[PDB]
Amino acid sequence: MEGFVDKIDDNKYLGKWETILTDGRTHLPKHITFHDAAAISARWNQQYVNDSGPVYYRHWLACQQTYGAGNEDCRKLRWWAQQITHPLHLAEWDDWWKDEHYDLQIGQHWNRICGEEFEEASNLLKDLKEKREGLAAKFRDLLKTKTAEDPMGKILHEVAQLEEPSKTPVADLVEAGTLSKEAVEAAAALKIKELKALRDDATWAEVKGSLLNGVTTTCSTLKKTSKVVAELKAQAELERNKTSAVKLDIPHMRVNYEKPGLYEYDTWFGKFLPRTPQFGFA
């Protein structure tokens, strides 16, 4: 990963490095059993596996309705649902999901709302999404045009659109005429002055004084909300075995940096994923 830049979020660049890094000659594991795969294969251990796909798809639905499809836990659940669910069921359920059938507020799946009311609400929600996405696309384009103005922005933009993922991208760019030693030196000067400012005691003290309030307020809030979250968790836990139904534990599974499983190994901790709306991409 010598030449891999994590800040770059170009889909093409990430795809090139997905091809480089997840190649089977070096990434395929030999004689390895993953606990996640074993557990999923032990819960539904027969050939008839029609019952796993619905459960994992609904786990992802609840997770991404509570937190949105961009959350890393939601992405993990979506990856597993795709792995273990047959594409016929996935296609049908994705068609329903695109129609706001699984929405938590006005979706008929979770609510007893009649057809006409559901229709009008879903149309309103989809139009809202369309308008917001149009505005967001315009804003993203404008921000991307402005980013290239800055020295480092220009260098990263030129690195991203390089034809092949190289081990030494900046050297290749400066040795091919695409970038200029002068621009590289200017960017390095900007970075050096920023670094010196950060480690300067006086400027760092100024920054700390400027940012102390927000951090302190956030800490106070999320230390106060901890108790109430625990009380809610216990009260819901009283519902675990109240009836024959199964209670949800949103999120079902999270990204585990301490005990990585198959998802973390295959996607490099959620970095190389399909670039479809179900994963929170445009």
Partner 1 sequence: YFTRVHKYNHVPVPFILNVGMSISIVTSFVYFTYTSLWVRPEYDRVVDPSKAYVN
Q: Which residues bind partner 1 (CB under 8 A)?
A: 26-32, 265
Task: Write down the least CB distance from residue 30 to partner 1, Å.
Answer: 4
Residue closer to partner 1, measured from CB, 27 or 146: 27
Residue closer to partner 1, measured from CB, 28 or 238: 28
Residue closer to partner 1, measured from CB, 27 or 129: 27
Task: Write down the least CB distance from residue 32 to partner 1, Å.
Answer: 6
CB 50 within 8 Å of CB 74:
no
Residue closer to partner 1, measured from CB, 32 or 234: 32
First vs last C-alpha separation in the chain: 26
DSSP, residue by residue, 178-240: SS-HHHHHHHHHHHHHHHHHHH-HHHHHHHHHHHHHHHHHHHHHHHHHHHHHHHHHHHHHTTT
Residue closer to partner 1, measured from CB, 48 or 257: 257
Task: Write down the least CB distance from residue 8 to partner 1, Å.
Answer: 22
Task: Answer whether the bond into residue 251 is a cis peptide, omega within 30°.
Answer: yes
Task: Write down the least CB distance from residue 251 to partner 1, Å.
Answer: 26
Q: 203-225 burial, b if ≥16 CB within 10 A, otherwise e?
A: eeeeeeeeeeeeeeeeeeeeeee
SS3 call for 123: helix
Task: Write down the least CB distance from residue 29 to partner 1, Å.
Answer: 6
Residues 273-276: contacts with CB under 8 Å, at least 24 apart = 273/75, 273/79, 274/82, 275/11, 275/15
